[PDB]
Write an enzyme that holds these catalytic residues in place. Structure first.
Site, PDB file in Angstrom:
ATOM      1  N   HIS A  51       0.854  -1.209   0.000  1.00  0.00           N
ATOM      2  CA  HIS A  51       0.000   0.000   0.000  1.00  0.00           C
ATOM      3  C   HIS A  51       0.884   1.252   0.000  1.00  0.00           C
ATOM      4  O   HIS A  51       0.642   2.157  -0.826  1.00  0.00           O
ATOM      5  CB  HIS A  51      -0.975  -0.049   1.171  1.00  0.00           C
ATOM      6  N   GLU A  52       1.873   1.303   0.891  1.00  0.00           N
ATOM      7  CA  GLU A  52       2.697   2.515   1.119  1.00  0.00           C
ATOM      8  C   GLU A  52       3.636   2.700  -0.075  1.00  0.00           C
ATOM      9  O   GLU A  52       3.735   3.814  -0.571  1.00  0.00           O
ATOM     10  CB  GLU A  52       3.453   2.432   2.441  1.00  0.00           C
ATOM     11  N   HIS A  59       1.846   4.218  -3.043  1.00  0.00           N
ATOM     12  CA  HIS A  59       1.766   5.708  -2.998  1.00  0.00           C
ATOM     13  C   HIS A  59       2.926   6.281  -3.807  1.00  0.00           C
ATOM     14  O   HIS A  59       2.727   7.310  -4.495  1.00  0.00           O
ATOM     15  CB  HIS A  59       1.756   6.280  -1.569  1.00  0.00           C
ATOM     16  N   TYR A  77      -3.683  14.572  -3.035  1.00  0.00           N
ATOM     17  CA  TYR A  77      -4.096  13.751  -1.875  1.00  0.00           C
ATOM     18  C   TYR A  77      -5.267  14.440  -1.160  1.00  0.00           C
ATOM     19  O   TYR A  77      -5.202  14.626   0.057  1.00  0.00           O
ATOM     20  CB  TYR A  77      -2.910  13.427  -0.968  1.00  0.00           C
ATOM     21  N   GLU A  94      -5.862   6.581  -2.614  1.00  0.00           N
ATOM     22  CA  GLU A  94      -6.073   5.610  -1.513  1.00  0.00           C
ATOM     23  C   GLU A  94      -6.555   4.279  -2.091  1.00  0.00           C
ATOM     24  O   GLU A  94      -6.019   3.224  -1.644  1.00  0.00           O
ATOM     25  CB  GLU A  94      -7.052   6.169  -0.482  1.00  0.00           C
ATOM     26  N   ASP A 121     -10.175  14.040   7.032  1.00  0.00           N
ATOM     27  CA  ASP A 121      -9.386  13.028   6.282  1.00  0.00           C
ATOM     28  C   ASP A 121      -9.129  13.555   4.859  1.00  0.00           C
ATOM     29  O   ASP A 121      -9.276  12.773   3.908  1.00  0.00           O
ATOM     30  CB  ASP A 121     -10.108  11.681   6.370  1.00  0.00           C
ATOM     31  N   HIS A 140      -9.621   8.227   2.888  1.00  0.00           N
ATOM     32  CA  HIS A 140      -9.676   6.824   3.387  1.00  0.00           C
ATOM     33  C   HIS A 140     -11.123   6.316   3.426  1.00  0.00           C
ATOM     34  O   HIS A 140     -11.329   5.098   3.702  1.00  0.00           O
ATOM     35  CB  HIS A 140      -9.005   6.732   4.754  1.00  0.00           C
TER      36      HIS A 140
END
Ligand SMILES: N[C@@H](CCCC[NH3+])C(=O)O
Ligand SMILES: CC(C)[C@H](N)C(=O)O
Ligand SMILES: [Ca+2]
Ligand SMILES: [Ca+2]
Ligand SMILES: [Ca+2]
Ligand SMILES: [Ca+2]
Ligand SMILES: [Zn+2]
Length: 316
Positions: A142-143, A146, A157, A166, A226, A231
């Site tokens: 996931h990271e 990005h 973002y 996301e 957020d 998210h």
């Protein structure tokens, strides 16, 4: 560091034993020379100074509980590298074999992980909400995804563009989970979320409303929390990816599933060829429909299922 390529062994966050690519020069360093310009794992040593020190070990054995998050950050960065290389012909996150840097033991009781624009960062968690977040292959993938997004579409973002961002990270996080093929699922973070509670996860792609995330455009969050629900509104796209892959019937709309490979190819093609920094949900549908058309032709089941999936979550 300059040195010899070697193979060490250790235990991950979950007590699983695995081999890791190290470099020897007096110490054994969590430096993998086998993958692009290498994969480097650092100890932040419970501080917020980054990256910290290149992870160093006297004997090339990583069995201390302190070692466990570093082992997983290092190993799952490698699996993620391999996924983008073998499945999408992509060399690291920038397409030119950029060095992949990870720091573990960030801060104290930190219940998150992130891409900081230059590297991945993993907390240890507080032992209640999370254990070390590098323990989740879907979290690591996931990271690092990005990073891929940042060098490709550059989705802002914020708002819908942030939610696609996301979603892409959850989709490719999950497809890397499946590629590594341990006990893969369509949930995000099950391996490291709430060690006291079995069967739960941070987010669900199969049923996002299980954790209070919308599964239809009409239920979208329009507030400012957020960064405009990056998210949260990710559930609408997450559910669409799930229906494209696996199929199902959602608010009475039926989608024929075409599997994970095709889902990957379509969404990788959309990401690298059609999406822009300001792309919204509507432009993601057009991009995903164009990608399936490019790959499988306008009249294919593959294009039909992308259309039915975007119809099912209410994105025209
Ligand atoms: N990655 C998500 C969930 C992390 C857990 C909340 N501390 C976020 O930062 O919003
Ligand atoms: C925990 C992880 C998957 C991410 N930083 C959120 O979502
Ligand atoms: Ca050791
Ligand atoms: Ca799993
Ligand atoms: Ca998962
Ligand atoms: Ca749990
Ligand atoms: Zn994310």
């Amino acid at each position: 560091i300059t040195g010899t390529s070697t193979v060490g062994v250790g235990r991950g966050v979950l007590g699983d034993q695995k081999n890791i690519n190290t470099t020897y020069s007096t110490y054994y360093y969590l430096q993998d020379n086998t993958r692009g310009n290498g994969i480097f794992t650092y100890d932040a040593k419970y501080r917020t100074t980054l990256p910290g020190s290149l992870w160093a070990d006297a004997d090339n054995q990583f069995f201390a509980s302190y070692d466990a998050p570093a082992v997983d950050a290092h190993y799952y960065a490698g699996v993620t590298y391999d996924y983008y290389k073998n499945v999408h012909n992509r060399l690291s996150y920038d397409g030119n074999n950029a060095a992949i840097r990870s720091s573990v033991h960030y801060s104290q009781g930190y219940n998150n992980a992130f891409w900081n624009g230059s590297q991945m960062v993993y907390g240890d968690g507080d032992g209640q909400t999370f254990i070390p977040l590098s323990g989740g292959i879907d979290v690591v993938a996931h990271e690092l995804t990005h990073a891929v997004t940042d060098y490709t579409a550059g989705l802002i973002y914020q708002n819908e563009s942030g939610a696609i961002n996301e979603a892409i990270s959850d989709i490719f996080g999950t497809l890397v989970e499946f590629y590594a093929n341990k006990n893969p699922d369509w949930e995000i973070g099950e391996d490291v979320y709430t060690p006291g509670i079995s069967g739960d996860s941070l987010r669900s792609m199969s049923d996002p409303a299980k954790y209070g995330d919308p599964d239809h455009y009409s239920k979208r969050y329009t507030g400012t929390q957020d960064n405009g629900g990056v998210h949260i509104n990710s559930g609408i796209i997450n559910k669409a990816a799930y229906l494209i892959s696996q199929g199902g019937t959602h608010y009475g709309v039926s989608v024929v599933g075409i599997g994970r490979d095709k889902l990957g190819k379509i969404f990788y093609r959309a990401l690298t060829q059609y999406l822009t920094p300001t792309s919204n949900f509507s432009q993601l549908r057009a991009a995903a429909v164009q990608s399936a058309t490019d790959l499988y032709g306008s009249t294919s089941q593959e294009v039909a299922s992308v259309k039915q999936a975007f119809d099912a979550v209410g994105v025209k």
